[PDB]
Design brief:
GO terms for molecular function: DNA binding; protein heterodimerization activity; structural constituent of chromatin. By secondary structure, this protein is mainly alpha-helical. It has three helices and no strands. The longest helix has 10 residues. The protein binds one DNA strand of 94 nucleotides through loops.
DNA sequence: GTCTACGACCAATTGAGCGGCCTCGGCACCGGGATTCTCGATCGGAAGAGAGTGAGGACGAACGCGCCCCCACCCCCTTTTATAGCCCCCCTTC
């Protein structure tokens, strides 16, 4: 999953960001590592719909 | 309770794995040009406040008709008598 995230980011070397995106995107890995914090991994790019502007 | 399968413990072996050394290309940062996006500003698209039409409604109003209420009077009922023609119902003659 980390390699797939790297290709999606057009990167060839796996970095903590790719590991975090993989662990958090997978529903089962996110459950195994829910209590785990990954250094320099950041967080998933998610915004609550209610915060987005409306027309 | 029975037992023996296989794990701890030893010795000798060794090549898989780690520290050191090297490097070159994945990455990032830069810059320039192209693109997106954002939204204050013009007014298309559809809707309101405000006006006019067509339109009768309920009923306030206005007019003659009604009904009962009841003024009061008028009157008729009843009683007595004379007088007479007139009239109807009944009896009598035919």
């Amino acid at each position: 999953l980390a390699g797939n995230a790297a290709r999606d980011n057009k990167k060839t070397r796996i970095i903590p960001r790719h590991l975090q995106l993989a662990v958090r995107n997978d529903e089962e890995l996110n459950k195994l590592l829910g209590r785990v914090t990954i250094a320099q991994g950041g967080v998933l790019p998610n915004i609550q719909s209610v915060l987005l502007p409306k027309k």
